[PDB]
Symmetry: D3
Subunit: 285 residues, 6 copies
């Protein structure tokens, strides 16, 4: 259930995020506040786009800072069928109007990402695939928390949250260490026993070498589907312990061709780099 | 000229921004650094998407913090023809690898935005229009600086940077003040004489009321082009002092329809909410 | 009207300000707390200086942070006739005594500035002048928010809040650009369309060049009143669109000589650089 | 005065400077395009008499913005207007970005140093050897500059904050239920490394405070005719106890408050009513 | 000890708590889904002997996380294991989020307070009335908890930081060119509200330091046989000067350093080598 | 290899740490600086305790901020035989004396922890045991980075760095979930696929349940050694995939009794909670 995902959020990081957003939007005097005054008011939140609602905790934390309350008519994760009345916000008029843009901006993006994740999860399910659709570290700097949380709301896995969550050996590591085996052995020796090591591999030879040197996960990078499945099949046969991830150029359109019985995870840069924001408005009534 | 735009950037805000992005990506121990080591290294930056290059100052600031140096082979604002060698980065291997994803993320989004901005400016120029294409406050919270700067690099105007740069009376302010004239009179009385007042108007009646009560700018919100131009024409005839801005549902496709001799400014949420990130990579060699 | 001015204040910036002032005054252990104890207490706030009361929202925020409550016997902006009971503060004794000095310091300076502002407004009104008395950027660093707010409470305009609110071309910009016309044309081309451009001019020739190149405001800097008024008169006659501001060595004493029918704004460094703080005390009873 | 810069906590200085620059320009700076990045030079002019103070702040502001400063007058010099005080060099837009915050800081620091030197001069002129001191009546957020200014003027800063000295005031006396209870509580609570000072509005109080173990007694709001007899008796009975006078002391009445039994005279006016000096920065 | 909480600067406290929680969980907390948000209650167990200290920190951690705490023992109580000390309440995932950081803080605060109480007790048992004290030998970033723990245990904290007292050390002596130059420079530089203490490794230095106007003289690394004759002479000729002993003082040798002419005994061990107490927080 | 471990450190978090330490030790004026002056000076760093040298990167960062340089005569991780000359520090006198205590405090605690870790690793090696000696999250709040680093320099594994690095089900999670199986199934479902799940088990029955429900690691908590090894033996025989950790009341003295062939990891709170600081001094010469 998506309603439970809010529990994941670090509250100290949340509060600081919210403050820095409001500071960004209004660092000094807000002259518009005299236009609206402090009279108690109510505003309706409208969804004008189809997709998945995500970002309630952030929307709430923005408005709570500004002494406003929110009532949701749809739970976190609901399908959105425009034009829908999603929520009501109450508080002093200038407070509502001060938070409006930042709150809509957050909900729009979080919902945009959750929508793209859900479409990808749906296409995979429709192709018979049971594994994890996942995001990447291709997130807007400073805004990871919202973006990874959006992915989760959409039913995708977030993948490692940051550099501290998993040790990922990539092409650049392989080059710097002087070869796949040296890179993986160094990664394995260096990584705390609590961490997994994943290795980005551009061929089957690399993947085998990586599995032999102790990789927990092998990421098959930029394979055409026709070489991908035979590669994953062998790896799973020779190394059934190793998880297999596919990534590189995977889109909502081609995703079903990348699904296969020997792929455990499919990760997509597009879920965060190319998810258009949903359209929401907040109309004072 | 785009190479000069870096001078606009508040350096204190920049350095803090860069810190907070690196803190977001790696808050604790970075075990991968043992895989690469500290040996001096070089990496090529590759452009794999068409569009406009934007974000050099951010990319530089990230790598300078990490004791790396960057050489650009393309000036800020260049057209990108993939696959193009854009830059070279140099530093200790683990520093390069630490900054890579955050640097590419920033460059990708900034460039994505600038690209969409230039496409919009090109379509307007091609429909004979001389005014400003502009952005909005529909930006990713915490990342406005990069986004507004991207718009500038693409030849669009940024529009007000935040709530302190202009007083904008919107449908919500109109509702709260109890009507157009009350809202605008309160905005004008409240705003420091150094500020302009702009008024969002959904009809010609509103626009006239707003001009009469002293608006510097009138924004015609969500007009079909057929109603937009007659409205603008009347407004400019009666109130030649008043600048006219069009906004609402304007896309790269329909933009030429919204250009007209009496529109001074066209603003587009899509330039920031729906600009896909460009594809860059940073390959150690 | 002054009771409504509190609405202008950015709440995130206010909270961090207050934190940082209390940190500055007591970074570590506060041994004096043990002398007072945590017994609920009450203190009276005394105004011992004539002038205008300003700064209630800062005084309140300091005490709220420290779990104390304040009741005002006088609204924000009231004339102060010493010795007057202005407020009651309640909370744990050690909390009251911890906040005392910072709260009095803030109210003293805010009130000092508001008083100088009101005296200036009064002297202008008495000389028949209708325009804006305004402050400058000559503010104590880190304290601008309290100083600009003080101005407003005293009836003066704040002028631009910071470098983002207006583009102001000064003698140094003229030098760096190579001449008045090049500076103004560069300012106009650079500034977002939402911003005004104001140009500091030391002669009537400069003012005409600035008005011709597109200035919204011309600031006549350091004129003796005898040269100022003819200059303003000409300017208004040729360029009735252009607002005219006088500034430089304007004091409460000479201010009536600087008022004239063709001056729109008079700005005074003294309102923030040389306003003595009012005398307040907070006596536990 | 040239050595006083050493006192400054560098971590606190850097953060101060950042927050001042952030305050003055949080977002895009369009004016930078008007000046460009060409190397430039600007002269610092002193247009007010008084004492120069605040070099380390001015330097720190300009170093952040990749500019350099050369001083023609050392910290603490007497200013005779119109004087060429310094030269600043760097990219034009950097100079102009730092200008106003740097002038604002030097103006206020110098203002305070000037009032402090005037007060030190008037005291010396009246034969007094004691310490002229400031108070905690400082602009919030700007104490570091203000206390430093006092020192450049030759005044003592007094306790820097609540953690440097335990000061028992009228309010503490009321809350504790009397002078003796307040002072005994202050003395028991304060770490042995700290002094205890007690604000006393009468001789009876001062005697009680001294008897209860005060290191300093601050005679608050005495008219000078009652002040000196009071200090005299105190010094005679309790020669260990330093005596400070404070309350309504001004540059004008200060010589009346000097006496052989006052050790310290503190003045709110040195920080609450010191006008800022006039400086400008002219690009040339 | 119940009143010591009032000493704590609330702004510094809140920021401390935030940074501890950020340190322990900067990103997503997947464990939260295992416990859920149902209301819950946990018992706090003391498994070590010693002195309980750190309640205000433990409370601030849990208050931030919307949990409440009830204490069954007041701050400063003797702990006899295994004792039920407190109950915590709140949403399950909030309790479990706070648990480790809260226990970490109480464990260390209590560890320090226990060592301090042991040291005060051994001194009292050897007839000594002076102050047992800490040093600046604290964990960086964690000074507030460590100094507060010292207080709860009955030791003095000593100067909180570099701003509380001016301390001339070996290294100042070398840099200034000798004891007298160092102490005269310290005295001239220090605001009149501050004391000056001087670290001395011989009687010669102690006398010189007293003569130059030191308020306190710290006899560093003396064997007890040389310490007491030195302190005796110092008190005889300079009764105004407080005498502190420090260096290699342990719980074991402490009684040999107590003497009628020692005012303060400071021990690095109270903070450098105090084992944390064992506490657990068991959901029931 | 200890000299390489410095690369693990996140540079942004490091710099912020160092700042906050210096701010804690001297928030306002430092009158002692006038006693030393600014003359260039040198100081020798002396080790007066046996054990292992750890913390150079911290010590260097402190001094670099204060414009001092450090030369090490012993590499990071060296055995310390007192009284040894470990390093030389150079810079202006007042800068050296400002950083001295905080630098010593850091080096002292880091080295203390590294010494305890190395003593533990030695005793294990001496009892024939090959597995990882590890720390815990029982670290001084705010100072984890230095403490986990110290562990690594002494040859111990750090264990998970924070709550983000691994999902650890403890007795409390078990009670809150309503049983071992429900807790582990919830942990696995909730944890991103990139994370491992470890389960604290106080009996063999729980350990079996945890392994069956999908635990990657089982932590045998508070076993007497006589019950431990037979439990581990059974567990390894039925679940060879599952790593086994022992923990609870393990000390340097009893550690060899806890080593065994079916234990992979032994973690010890004492390494961080009861490690006395080493004695170092810095003597200006
Ligand atoms: O962002 C990437 O390069 C990336 C792409 C796919 C999976 C994981 C990651 C990651 O770094 O966490
Ligand atoms: O964000 C918006 O709603 C917006 C849309 C168009 C122009 C300007 C703005 C603005 O608020 O600055
Ligand atoms: O501070 C100044 O120099 C100043 C003086 C007069 C008007 C405006 C300003 C300003 O820069 O905003
Ligand atoms: O600020 C005050 O009220 C004050 C006034 C005189 C001396 C000292 C102080 C002080 O508090 O430090
Ligand atoms: O930390 C020290 O070296 C020290 C040792 C003993 C007393 C006081 C201190 C101190 O500096 O506060
Ligand atoms: O700190 C603990 O309780 C602990 C004890 C042993 C291993 C790991 C941990 C951990 O939580 O990281």
């Amino acid at each position: 259930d998506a309603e439970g995902l809010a529990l994941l959020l670090p509250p100290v990081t949340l509060a600081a995020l919210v403050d820095s957003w409001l500071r960004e939007d209004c660092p000094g005097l807000n002259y518009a506040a005299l236009v609206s005054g402090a009279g108690p008011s109510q505003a309706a939140l409208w969804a004008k786009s189809p997709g998945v609602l995500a970002g309630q905790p952030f929307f709430d934390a923005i408005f709570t800072q500004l002494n406003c309350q929110v009532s949701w008519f749809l739970p976190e994760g609901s399908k959105l069928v425009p034009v829908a009345r999603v929520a009501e916000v109450r508080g002093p008029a200038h407070c509502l109007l001060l938070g409006e843009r930042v709150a809509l901006n957050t909900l729009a993006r979080c919902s945009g990402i959750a929508s793209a994740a859900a479409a990808a999860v749906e296409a995979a399910r429709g192709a018979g695939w049971t594994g994890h659709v996942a995001g990447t570290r291709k997130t807007t700097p400073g805004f990871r928390l919202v973006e990874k949380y959006g992915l989760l709301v959409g039913g995708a896995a977030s993948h490692r949250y940051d550099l501290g969550g998993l040790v990922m050996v990539k092409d650049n590591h392989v080059v710097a260490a002087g070869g796949v085996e040296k890179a993986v052995r160094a990664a394995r020796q260096a990584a705390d026993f609590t961490l997994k090591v994943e290795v980005e591999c551009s061929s089957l030879q690399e993947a085998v070498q990586a599995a032999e040197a102790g990789a927990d996960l092998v990421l098959l990078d930029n394979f055409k589907p026709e070489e991908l499945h035979p590669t994953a099949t062998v790896l799973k046969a020779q190394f059934p312990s190793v998880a297999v991830e596919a990534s590189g150029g995977i889109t909502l359109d081609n995703l079903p061709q990348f699904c296969g019985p020997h792929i455990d995870v499919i990760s997509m840069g597009m879920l965060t780099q190319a998810a258009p924001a949903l359209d929401f408005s907040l109309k004072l009534f």
